[PDB]
Structure 1
Amino acid sequence: AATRREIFKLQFHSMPVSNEVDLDELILQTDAYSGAEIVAVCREAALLALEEDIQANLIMKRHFTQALSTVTPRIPESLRRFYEDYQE
């Protein structure tokens, strides 16, 4: 959770994001996400906010809900259970 907050803070430095979004709710929904996929969620939510008003200034919360439904974790739950049982 602390690593994913630093990945989100590097990408939110450049993009114009509104203050309506909640960062803690996005951290909880992006469990089992690789670091390259958090860049892809932030890139796709900027493109979806451009489509509903070419001249866009800010990104809302509803774009992030649609962007997380399109981009999924590639890692299945069989490999998640194996790599946590190997450390135990």
Structure 2
Amino acid sequence: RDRRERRLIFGTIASKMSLAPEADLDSLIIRNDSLSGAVIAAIMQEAGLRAVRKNRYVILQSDLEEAYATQVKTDNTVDKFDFYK
């Protein structure tokens, strides 16, 4: 859940891949979730697949933003009911 840990691991995964220069992972990690050390790699895999679908061979920020919406939506629990808090 620490911002520094997610930043470190996101950078580690991004370094091997082909992130575009105009793509910010800090914009992806603005919100503090319970993101695991594995989902935050499958999200980048999904972003890469999304970029490949649009024939782009280098992933952009617009695909990283969409990847967050498809691999991490909710844990359900009670956040689906706002009136509890």
Tell me the TM-score range normalised by the shorter chain.
Answer: 0.7 to 0.9
Give the TM-score normalised by the residue count of structure 2: 0.75
* Structure 1 residue 30 displacement after superposition: 5.5
In the alignment, is the contact (CA less than 8 A) between 2:28 and 2:68 conserved in 1? no
Report the CA distance shift for 1:41/1:10 in structure 2 as closer, same or farther (over 3 A). same
The SS at the match of 1:12 is helix
Structure 2: gaps spanning 5 or more residues: 79-85
Match of 1:57 in 2: 57
Match of 1:26 in 2: 28
Structure 1: gaps spanning 5 or more residues: 79-88
Provide the aligned C-alpha RMSD in A. 1.9
Match of 1:69 in 2: 69
Between the aligned residues of both structures, percent identity stands at 32
* Structure 1 residue 29 displacement after superposition: 3.5
Aligned length: 76
Give the TM-score normalised by the residue count of structure 1: 0.73
Report the CA distance shift for 1:39/1:11 in structure 2 as closer, same or farther (over 3 A). same
Q: Tell me which amino acid in the other structure corresponds to 2:69.
A: S
Instruction: Say which one has the larger Rg.
Output: 1
